[PDB]
Amino acid sequence: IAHHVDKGSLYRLGPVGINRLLNKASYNVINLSSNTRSSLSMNSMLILITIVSLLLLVLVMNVNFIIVIPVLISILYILFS
Amino acid sequence: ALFTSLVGASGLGFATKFLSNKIRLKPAGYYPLGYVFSGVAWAGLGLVLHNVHQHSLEVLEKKK
Amino acid sequence: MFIGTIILVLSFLGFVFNRRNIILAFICLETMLLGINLILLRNSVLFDDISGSLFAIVIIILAGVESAIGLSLLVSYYRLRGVINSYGI
Amino acid sequence: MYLTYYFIEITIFLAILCTIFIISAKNPMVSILYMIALFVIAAMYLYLIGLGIFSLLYIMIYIGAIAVLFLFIITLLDINSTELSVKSNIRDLPLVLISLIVLTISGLMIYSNDSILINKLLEAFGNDYNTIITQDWFNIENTTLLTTIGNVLLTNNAFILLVLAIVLLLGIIGPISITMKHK
Amino acid sequence: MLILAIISLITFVSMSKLSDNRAIIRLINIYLILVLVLDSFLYLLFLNNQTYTVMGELLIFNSFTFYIDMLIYFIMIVISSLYGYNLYNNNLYKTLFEPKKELIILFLINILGALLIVHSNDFITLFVAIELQSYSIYLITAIYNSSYKASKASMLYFFMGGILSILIAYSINTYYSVLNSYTLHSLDSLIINTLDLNLILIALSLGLLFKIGIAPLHKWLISIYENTPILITIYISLIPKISILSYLVLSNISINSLVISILAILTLLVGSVGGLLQIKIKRLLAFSGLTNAGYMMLLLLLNNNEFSYLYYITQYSISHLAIFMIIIFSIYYINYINNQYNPIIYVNQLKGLIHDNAYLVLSMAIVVFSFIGIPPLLGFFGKLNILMSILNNGYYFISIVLIVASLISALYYLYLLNVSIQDKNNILINSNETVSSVLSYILSSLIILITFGFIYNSLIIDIFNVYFN
Amino acid sequence: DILNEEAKIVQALNNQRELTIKMHELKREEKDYAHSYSPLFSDPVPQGGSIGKAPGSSR
Amino acid sequence: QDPIPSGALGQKVPHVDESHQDLLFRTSHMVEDLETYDEDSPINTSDANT
Amino acid sequence: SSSTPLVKTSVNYSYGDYPLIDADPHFKRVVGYMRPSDYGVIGLATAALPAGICFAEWLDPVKGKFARPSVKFLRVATMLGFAVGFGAAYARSSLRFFGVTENAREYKKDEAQMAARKAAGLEPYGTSSLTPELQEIAAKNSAHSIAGLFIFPWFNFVNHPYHGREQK
Numbered sequence A: 001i002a003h004h005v006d007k008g009s010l011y012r013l014g015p016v017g018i019n020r021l022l023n024k025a026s027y028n029v030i031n032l033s034s035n036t037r038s039s040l041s042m043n044s045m046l047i048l049i050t051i052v053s054l055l056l057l058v059l060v061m062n063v064n065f066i067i068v069i070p071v072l073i074s075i076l077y078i079l080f081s
Numbered sequence B: 001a002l003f004t005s006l007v008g009a010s011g012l013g014f015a016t017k018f019l020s021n022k023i024r025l026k027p028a029g030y031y032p033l034g035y036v037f038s039g040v041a042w043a044g045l046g047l048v049l050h051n052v053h054q055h056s057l058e059v060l061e062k063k064k
Numbered sequence C: 001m002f003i004g005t006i007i008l009v010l011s012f013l014g015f016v017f018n019r020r021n022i023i024l025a026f027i028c029l030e031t032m033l034l035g036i037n038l039i040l041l042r043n044s045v046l047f048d049d050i051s052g053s054l055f056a057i058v059i060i061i062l063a064g065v066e067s068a069i070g071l072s073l074l075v076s077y078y079r080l081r082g083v084i085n086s087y088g089i
Numbered sequence D: 001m002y003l004t005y006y007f008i009e010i011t012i013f014l015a016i017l018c019t020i021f022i023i024s025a026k027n028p029m030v031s032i033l034y035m036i037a038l039f040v041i042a043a044m045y046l047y048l049i050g051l052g053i054f055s056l057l058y059i060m061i062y063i064g065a066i067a068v069l070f071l072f073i074i075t076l077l078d079i080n081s082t083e084l085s086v087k088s089n090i091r092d093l094p095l096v097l098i099s100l101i102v103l104t105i106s107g108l109m110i111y112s113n114d115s116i117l118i119n120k121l122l123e124a125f126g127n128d129y130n131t132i133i134t135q136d137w138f139n140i141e142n143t144t145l146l147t148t149i150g151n152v153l154l155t156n157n158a159f160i161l162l163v164l165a166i167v168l169l170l171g172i173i174g175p176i177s178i179t180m181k182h183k
Numbered sequence E: 001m002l003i004l005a006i007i008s009l010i011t012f013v014s015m016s017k018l019s020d021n022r023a024i025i026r027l028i029n030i031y032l033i034l035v036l037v038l039d040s041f042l043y044l045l046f047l048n049n050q051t052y053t054v055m056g057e058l059l060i061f062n063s064f065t066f067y068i069d070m071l072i073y074f075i076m077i078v079i080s081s082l083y084g085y086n087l088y089n090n091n092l093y094k095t096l097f098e099p100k101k102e103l104i105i106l107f108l109i110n111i112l113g114a115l116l117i118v119h120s121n122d123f124i125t126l127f128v129a130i131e132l133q134s135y136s137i138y139l140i141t142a143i144y145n146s147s148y149k150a151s152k153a154s155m156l157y158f159f160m161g162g163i164l165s166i167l168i169a170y171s172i173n174t175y176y177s178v179l180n181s182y183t184l185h186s187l188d189s190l191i192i193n194t195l196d197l198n199l200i201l202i203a204l205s206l207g208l209l210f211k212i213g214i215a216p217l218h219k220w221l222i223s224i225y226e227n228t229p230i231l232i233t234i235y236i237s238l239i240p241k242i243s244i245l246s247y248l249v250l251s252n253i254s255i256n257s258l259v260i261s262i263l264a265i266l267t268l269l270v271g272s273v274g275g276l277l278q279i280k281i282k283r284l285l286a287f288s289g290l291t292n293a294g295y296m297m298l299l300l301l302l303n304n305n306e307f308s309y310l311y312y313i314t315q316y317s318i319s320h321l322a323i324f325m326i327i328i329f330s331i332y333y334i335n336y337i338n339n340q341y342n343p344i345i346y347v348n349q350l351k352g353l354i355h356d357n358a359y360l361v362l363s364m365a366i367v368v369f370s371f372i373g374i375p376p377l378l379g380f381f382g383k384l385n386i387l388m389s390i391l392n393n394g395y396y397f398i399s400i401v402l403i404v405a406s407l408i409s410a411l412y413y414l415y416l417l418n419v420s421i422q423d424k425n426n427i428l429i430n431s432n433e434t435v436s437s438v439l440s441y442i443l444s445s446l447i448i449l450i451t452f453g454f455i456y457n458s459l460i461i462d463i464f465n466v467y468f469n
Numbered sequence F: 001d002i003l004n005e006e007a008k009i010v011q012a013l014n015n016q017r018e019l020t021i022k023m024h025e026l027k028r029e030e031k032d033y034a035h036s037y038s039p040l041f042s043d044p045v046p047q048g049g050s051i052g053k054a055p056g057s058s059r
Numbered sequence G: 001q002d003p004i005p006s007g008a009l010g011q012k013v014p015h016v017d018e019s020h021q022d023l024l025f026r027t028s029h030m031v032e033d034l035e036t037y038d039e040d041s042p043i044n045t046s047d048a049n050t
Numbered sequence H: 001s002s003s004t005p006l007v008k009t010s011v012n013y014s015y016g017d018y019p020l021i022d023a024d025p026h027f028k029r030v031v032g033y034m035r036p037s038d039y040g041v042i043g044l045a046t047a048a049l050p051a052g053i054c055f056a057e058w059l060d061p062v063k064g065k066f067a068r069p070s071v072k073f074l075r076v077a078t079m080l081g082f083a084v085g086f087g088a089a090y091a092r093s094s095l096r097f098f099g100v101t102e103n104a105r106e107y108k109k110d111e112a113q114m115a116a117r118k119a120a121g122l123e124p125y126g127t128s129s130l131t132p133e134l135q136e137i138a139a140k141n142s143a144h145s146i147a148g149l150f151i152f153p154w155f156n157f158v159n160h161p162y163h164g165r166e167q168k
């Protein structure tokens, strides 16, 4: 209990597992735009997707609501990991 | 009361002059007339805010 | 509204998908403003008013002063460097 | 006489063609030369719709100043530029083929007021109906278009002309703010 | 009386020399002080949320707009009191932080452009005023021409602001195409039921919102903020945010907006987890700008957001302003100085600051606890009054993600303290020259507002009640 | 002498509670065109654009 | 003078000395942050536009 | 004929606790009816800008040594002090027309002068050299322009019929 529960698994849902979770998710949103020192072309091909992805997202929404939730979970997965 | 509402804002002014001395690495009483300047300035701010609140209360009283 | 939407969308994708020079960005930005004008002026005609033409004669001026400002920004960028890169700023 | 009918759809096709020659060119001057071609195709459309005054304002300032400005910049500056090769630009094709469809159809969606999302699009194309032009004899002086712009900029919207003064002011101050190096 | 200043000073700066620039900025500072002191009795015009439409359905003058109109002059006095005044009288401190000749002109042209949006009714005043202020940011950025990063930053900001300006003009044109009028009150609550307007009004919103840092397009702004010099960026981070956010909040065109709710959540996620592993101080500081500008699309979803907004904006402006001025003080004590335009770059560099002086770290501690919402501070009631409106109007998952975002954000706010209270090995025993008196009195006053604003919280609520209802 | 000094405070808090309920109802109350917009020029009615105007346009 | 600089998580961050602005360190691909080699150092400009 | 309003306008719609005279005062009227306590504010503002600059360099001098600023800046301080004093002067004196401040000695003068030009038979406000549509437009511009004194100066020079008064 003092090693497999108190220090083992209640820190995985505590300050040890969340340190690694935030380390991974921060590293991915940092590396969103890593290379391509042409930052103008890199930010400019990003403005197009974020008026296309939203524009298809709303089309998918107003036919059925349930089929955008896995889309949004998968966008969080590709964005944060 | 108006008087305590002046004294408290003047005490905020004394705190501004004190902390501004202490960032500059001066002693507590460095330019001890500057406490009078800040006290009068922030007390005047208390005058202003006190009178605005008075007039706002009277506008609410006249709506009945 | 076809000619305005087509200039806007195709000028926009000409802005987005360059990697070769800096001036194609400027001229695609300028033709986007043209594409907005082509839609606005026909809505002025078909509704019988000048007020879309009012916004037209204002946005002509703002496109002008936009070009003046932005090309002085480019000469700032070029003075300190030697040659404007191919890939971009 | 109905050779003289398709004149608008012609210039639409010419504008499509002309932007294809904007974004696919070798020199950086060839692109602005097709751009002044695009301005004059536009000015032909603006005369065609019933606006003779604007077309000449577009010639005055758009193949007027800002043309000469861009031609000038491309002269006295060196700018490296690659060609439209397939090995560097075919990777963008499956995004372009999505965004063409989506951005065009969505840009033709908002002219409608139904709530079906297929009757919204089909009101953009379902317009082959000829407006009827009556003669009303109510107007007495030739207040053309430019008179009314000069009446609305000067009385009803004098503040927009007067903020506009500050914008042109800024367009004078800015290049002297930058490109001088005082002392 | 901005233009009475601008027209006068532009002739005055045209003839003065390069040495006179400091004293010109001192003059303009004192001028703005006395415009705030001798002319601030115009609050009496409204007494029951009375709104005036001036210049003929073109400008709109109400009291929300009067408060923003007063807030911008106050923060401009604090910004202009930086360029006017020397930090120390040394060789380094003269060659650092030099104001250019045309800088003081471009500030007030930007304030004209920022005020004519919050006061704006027509779309054409909207468009001309976003253009005026966008130019002024193009040129406030590029005025330090002999900097490599600043020129690259101005050229990036140019094209991104240009795309979002054409997106706004497309939305304005499109609303004109579906309804003849330009004014927002042609809506008057009967249109929106019988008219599909949701797509137009969101594209008008998203056009301004993406100019500010709404988080799918957050990467370019962080780069511009890290690349400009450290004094351009306090101004160009404060001003466009508060100017257009009080526009979009005064005119509630996107209620229940699903796109706005998604991008609000995405902002609160990626800001609070983007600032986590970052070693540069202006970066950390700009993502603290991003999460806090994403407690804004939230109130933009609401109806009747004028206690939560205004309280949180003046909270955020004081807190923002104070922590930039803290690191501008902190550059004297650091051991390494690079990059003349941007002297402190890393948050590793302000180590051991408590052993240099303790009261600057006392100041830094109260501001960093005010960002994370610590209850006896003024920054707490801002989040409290956001949450008394989020939960008031049905946004429950928004509230949970707001809380989790605040907790993840506090982790990189407290890194500033973790660095600044540590052992340094090289303590200062005697500084020969001392920092400028007025420029440290300004920070002391901005602290004592933060730490003692809960005193006057109750007066503000009663005043508010009279003057907006 | 303490139950009375509580009744005073509880009246002083119920007064503030009723003050809040009022001032939260006074926000959502709809407002005139003369209070909300331009005080003089109280009509919304245009007569806009009178130079080449036609008799029979009013309704 | 500390052995391990921290980085708001359990991570190692580079202690940026004068020695990070070299011709070797120029043009190493990396995100806009966690990076050294500013383009504007008094050692990097080397009296440019002379 | 050149004095018919032909728009609809609120009548005696007071902006404060006191009765309005006037919805936009003509510039000559504002300079007429202002109190001596108002010329006070003009003088205090012309005094506060050069003394304000000399004070603000007594705090921290520009070149490290306390020297008086040059006469060159004291002249510009005097000019912009007259500018702030006139802005505060016009702003005060036209709050008195709106009935939002204390309105005692000017409601009597506006009984007096309006009654004294109803006896001379002329127009109650004055004949402008404008068509009545330009009077309407030019006074939709100058209505309530005293708010926004913080941005831009705008005044009434138009001499149009309507002022929110009882009959005309």
Ligand SMILES: CCCCC/C=C\C/C=C\CCCCCCCC(=O)O[C@H](COC(=O)CCCCCCCCCCCCCCC)COP(=O)([O-])OCC[N+](C)(C)C
Residues within 6 Å of the ligand: B009, B041, B042, B044, B045, B046, B048, B049, B052, E036, E037, E040, E041, E043, E067, E074, E306, E307, E310, E311, E314, E315, E378, E449, E452, E453, E454, E456, E457, E460, E463, E464, E467
């Ligand atoms: C003698 C001067 C010496 C030189 C000083 C120069 C500049 C001083 C500038 C600012 C000092 C702080 C004054 C705050 C005024 C707030 C008015 C107001 O609460 O606004 C309310 C509505 O606010 C809101 O919605 C919410 C705002 C929430 C504020 C959050 C932070 C407040 C906590 C500290 C602020 C109070 C500290 C008092 C210190 C004694 C509207 O009422 P109002 O517009 O009629 O008030 C202005 C009347 N006036 C012009 C005559 C003063």
